[PDB]
Amino acid sequence: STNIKKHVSQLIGRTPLVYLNKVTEGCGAYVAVKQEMMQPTASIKDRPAYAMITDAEEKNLITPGKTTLIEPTSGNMGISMAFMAAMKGYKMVLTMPSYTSLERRVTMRAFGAELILTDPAKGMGGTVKKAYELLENTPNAHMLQQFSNPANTQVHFETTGPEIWEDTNGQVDIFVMGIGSGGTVSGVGQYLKSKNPNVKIYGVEPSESNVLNGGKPGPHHITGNGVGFKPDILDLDVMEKVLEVSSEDAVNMARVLALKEGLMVGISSGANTVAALRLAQLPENKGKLIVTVHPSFGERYLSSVLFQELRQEAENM
Amino acid sequence: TNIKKHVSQLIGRTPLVYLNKVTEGCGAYVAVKQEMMQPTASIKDRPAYAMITDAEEKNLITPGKTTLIEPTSGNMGISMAFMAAMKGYKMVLTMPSYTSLERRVTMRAFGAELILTDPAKGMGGTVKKAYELLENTPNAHMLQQFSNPANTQVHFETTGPEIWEDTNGQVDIFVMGIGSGGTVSGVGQYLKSKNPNVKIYGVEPSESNVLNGGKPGPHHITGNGVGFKPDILDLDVMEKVLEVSSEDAVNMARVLALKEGLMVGISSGANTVAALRLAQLPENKGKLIVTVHPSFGERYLSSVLFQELRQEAENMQPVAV
Numbered sequence: 021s022t023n024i025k026k027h028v029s030q031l032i033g034r035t036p037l038v039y040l041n042k043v044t045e046g047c048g049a050y051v052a053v054k055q056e057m058m059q060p061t062a063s064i065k066d067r068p069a070y071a072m073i074t075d076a077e078e079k080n081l082i083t084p085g086k087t088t089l090i091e092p093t094s095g096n097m098g099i100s101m102a103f104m105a106a107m108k109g110y111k112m113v114l115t116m117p118s119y120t121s122l123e124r125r126v127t128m129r130a131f132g133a134e135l136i137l138t139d140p141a142k143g144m145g146g147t148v149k150k151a152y153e154l155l156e157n158t159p160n161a162h163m164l165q166q167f168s169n170p171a172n173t174q175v176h177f178e179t180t181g182p183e184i185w186e187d188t189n190g191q192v193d194i195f196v197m198g199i200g201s202g203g204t205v206s207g208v209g210q211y212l213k214s215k216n217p218n219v220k221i222y223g224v225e226p227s228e229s230n231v232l233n234g235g236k237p238g239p240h241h242i243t244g245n246g247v248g249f250k251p252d253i254l255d256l257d258v259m260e261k262v263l264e265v266s267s268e269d270a271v272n273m274a275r276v277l278a279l280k281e282g283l284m285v286g287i288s289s290g291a292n293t294v295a296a297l298r299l300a301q302l303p304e305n306k307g308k309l310i311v312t313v314h315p316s317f318g319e320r321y322l323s324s325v326l327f328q329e330l331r332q333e334a335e336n337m
Numbered sequence: 338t339n340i341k342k343h344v345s346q347l348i349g350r351t352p353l354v355y356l357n358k359v360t361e362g363c364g365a366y367v368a369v370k371q372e373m374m375q376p377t378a379s380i381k382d383r384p385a386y387a388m389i390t391d392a393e394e395k396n397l398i399t400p401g402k403t404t405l406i407e408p409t410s411g412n413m414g415i416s417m418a419f420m421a422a423m424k425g426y427k428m429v430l431t432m433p434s435y436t437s438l439e440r441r442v443t444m445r446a447f448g449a450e451l452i453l454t455d456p457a458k459g460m461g462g463t464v465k466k467a468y469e470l471l472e473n474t475p476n477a478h479m480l481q482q483f484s485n486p487a488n489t490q491v492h493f494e495t496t497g498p499e500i501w502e503d504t505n506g507q508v509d510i511f512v513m514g515i516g517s518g519g520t521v522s523g524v525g526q527y528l529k530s531k532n533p534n535v536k537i538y539g540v541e542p543s544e545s546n547v548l549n550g551g552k553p554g555p556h557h558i559t560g561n562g563v564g565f566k567p568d569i570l571d572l573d574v575m576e577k578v579l580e581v582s583s584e585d586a587v588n589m590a591r592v593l594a595l596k597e598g599l600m601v602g603i604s605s606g607a608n609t610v611a612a613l614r615l616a617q618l619p620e621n622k623g624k625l626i627v628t629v630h631p632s633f634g635e636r637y638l639s640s641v642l643f644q645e646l647r648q649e650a651e652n653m654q655p656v657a658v
């Protein structure tokens with residue numbers, strides 16, 4: 021009878037595409053960007069988070085008020101999981117290294133997640149072990165496992181990809197996306213292929229941490245991208261190749277997107293756009309429609325390198 | 338849809354959602370309009386677009402030529418910087434040197450020029466400074482948010498009609514905080530032109546209840562209670578102005594995140610408190626009450642909203658593995 025949503029989770033998905041007009045000077049191709057900032061949590065994460073918790077409910081694995089959900093994660097998957105746990109009324113326990121961002125930790129707590137900070141000296145391996153110890157010692161507990169839970173890939177197959185196919189009226193020639201868990205690129209990749217097999221799909225990863233192109237893992241600044249190993253759910257075969265983008269270029273492009281397109285986006289959005297533009301400058305792609313994603317809102321990263329210059333220029337005055 | 342041509346086409350058309358956890362069992366329907374879904378994540382994108390577009394159309398300004406000046410910070414500064422970056426205008430925002438570093442960095446990221454003024458002159462100093470700039474700069478134009486009727490008009494033309502459409506004409510009551518008064522005036526006039534029985538309430542801080550005859554004063558409801566009656570604000574359209582304390586608005590905002598999954602600001606809290614207060618009244622049982630959550634809460638990580646959480650987080654220690 022009305023267009024009023026019954027649930028906050030119904031605000032998830034169905035996000036807009038926008039053409040880039042300024043930054044695309046000298047490109048034979050059209051680039052459009054999917055804006056995931058328009059979600060309850062202001063990041064792409066909201067999709068997998070809903071999908072994993074909901075899938076586990078339908079399979080009768082978890083019960084609200086009785087199951088303790090456990091996950092070794094932080095950074096915008098942690099925020100989305102905390103968010104979902106709040107809406108559906110699950111106890112959510114998140115393990116992370118103590119050197120984790122204070123801004124992320126405060127945000128996850130605002131939704132009621134319990135945080136356990138593990139010893140810094142043991143890094144990620146520490147939080148994963150901690151989370152497994154808690155899973156084994158907690159009576160009604162369940163771990164989501166974002167890197168191997170196929171409901172992660174499935175959500176993009178059923179919502180992210182179909183949205184991209186519909187909004188471009190079947191015209192998308194090329195899809196570019198950074199790899200984190202690999203869920204987005206794998207799920208959108210498979211869906212687009214099943215509609216038109218000539219659609220080219222590309223991954224993006226940091227130059228400084230290029231493990232999928234045979235490099236060694238290492239620190240980088242493309243937040244959300246490049247975990248340093250191959251996730252189980254990542255589908256290597258659906259991609260033409262994994263493009264590499266340096267942190268420097270991704271950072272610079274993110275700044276430009278704000279100044280010239282009015283898109284306040286993160287470093288990951290930066291890297292995707294760099295990859296898209298350079299595909300868009302290739303002669304064979306002339307006239308083609310290339311789609312990429314801006315996975316989250318830029319204001320989340322106010323204390324990162326993205327606003328480094330602005331932050332200190334503003335301190336001095 | 339098809340692909341949009343400009344980011345500005347993503348302004349407006351925000352969804353309504355029912356609250357069901359903070360509202361048990363207040364006896365009325367409460368739906369909240371989610372303004373976080375805007376390019377700058379606040380309802381300040383509507384007015385900023387309308388005021389700049391209005392001036393272009395009356396040929397008072399031109400991109401590349403005109404310098405836009407405005408004494409503002411907060412959500413309206415961010416939105417103003419955002420609309421200038423997009424349309425191609427040089428933008429000058431004056432503000433007290435005490436304004437939040439994060440807001441300033443955000444305004445800078447869109448390319449606005451910032452001029453900070455004496456911490457002792459408060460708002461007056463920034464306004465005085467802005468008027469000097471206006472008179473000392475060739476081809477300068479000041480937007481004037483508190484006295485520009487294009488502010489009210491955008492809510493009459495978008496925000497109001499959206500609420501009437503999404504509720505399929507069933508809205509009985511609309512509650513909204515007053516900053517400039519644009520939203521409450523514009524939505525009010527619209528809704529009442531569709532159904533005169535619609536009740537429109539404004540909201541202000543207890544600590545600065547000027548519209549109720551009190552004296553101005555420091556409060557924590559960011560975006561709300563500017564300490565005087567803005568010119569564009571239409572008092573006649575409201576039944577009255579409800580007062581909400583800062584403590585209550587803050588508590589409501591924290592509870593909205595924990596129970597409803599809505600990460601919103603202190604102004605969203607204040608509006609939701611007022612909405613619940615109306616639900617308590619006998620004449621409002623069974624009615625559809627609509628209010629607004631004007632912004633995303635992550636913007637206020639440095640405010641009193643997050644204070645308890647920041648301290649608790651500072652004090653967490655690692656555990657052994």
Ligand SMILES: *Cc1c(COP(=O)(O)O)cnc(C)c1O
Pocket residue numbers: 063064065096198199200201202203204205243244245286288289315316
């Ligand atoms: C998750 C994430 C990605 C990568 O998405 P995946 O589906 O996990 O591979 C890219 N950018 C940001 C900001 C992300 O949060």
Ligand SMILES: *Cc1c(COP(=O)(O)O)cnc(C)c1O
Pocket residue numbers: 379380381412413514515516517518519520521559560561602604605631632
């Ligand atoms: C700007 C604003 C308001 C009030 O809107 P007006 O139309 O100016 O009265 C309320 N809350 C927040 C967060 C705002 O930015």
